[PDB]
Amino acid sequence: NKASVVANQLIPINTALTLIMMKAEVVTPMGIPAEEIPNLVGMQVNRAVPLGTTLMPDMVKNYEDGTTSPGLKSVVANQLIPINTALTLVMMKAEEVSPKGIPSEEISKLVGMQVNRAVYLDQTLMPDMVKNYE
């Protein structure tokens, strides 16, 4: 019904979108609308986006706070962290997002733990990536 956020140009992998790249056109499929334009802008995609691609929640990891109640809030790396780096709650954001990798129940004991793999922008933390997880 309303205008959806569809990228006008083609975007590469892991790239923050801009105002010129984000176009509010009324087209399908209806992915994410332009309500959280300031929150969705500069989001990093998981793969290459073609031209005229609508905002899809399955292609973007943590695009914005679309979920209302937390409950199943999993830890997510809001910023990019290099391999083997003691990251703490500052860069870790445990919010309700999919998929549900590792919850924030033992984060207090792993605060400032060194990861064994490379971490990208807003990505969900998983037990398969961390080899020193409890």
Quickly name the level 1 CATH class of the largest domain. Alpha Beta
Shape: elongated
Q: How many strands, what sense, and barrel or not for the largest sheet?
A: 3 strands, antiparallel
What series of H and E elements makes up the topology?
Answer: EEHEEEEHEE
PDB class: antifreeze protein
Keywords: antifreeze, antifreeze protein, thermal hysteresis protein, ICE binding protein
Assembly: monomeric
Entry title: NMR structure of intramolecular dimer antifreeze protein RD3, 40 SA structures
SSE topology:
Elements lengths: L3 E4 L14 E4 L11 H4 L12 E2 L18 E5 L8 E2 L4 E5 L10 H4 L2 E2 L8 E2 L10
Antiparallel strand pairs: 1-2, 1-3, 4-6, 4-8, 5-7
Describe this structure in words.
- 6% of the residues lie in helices and 19% in strands.
- With 134 residues, it is mainly beta.
- It starts with a strand and ends in a 10-residue tail after the last strand.
- The longest helix is centred in the first third of the chain and has 4 residues, at 37-40.
- The protein has helices at 37-40, 107-110; strands at 4-7, 22-25, 53-54, 73-77, 86-87, 92-96, 113-114, 123-124.
- The protein folds into two domains: 1-66, Type Iii Antifreeze Protein Isoform Hplc 12 (Alpha-Beta Complex); 71-134, Antifreeze-like/N-acetylneuraminic acid synthase C-terminal domain (Type Iii Antifreeze Protein Isoform Hplc 12).
- Contributes to protect fish blood from freezing at subzero sea water temperatures. Lowers the blood freezing point. Binds to nascent ice crystals and prevents further growth.
- Keywords: Antifreeze protein, Repeat, Secreted.
- The record marks 9, 14, 18, 44, 79, 84, 88, 114 as: Important for ice-binding.
- Belongs to the type-III AFP family.
- Residues 4-63, 74-133 form the AFP-like domain.
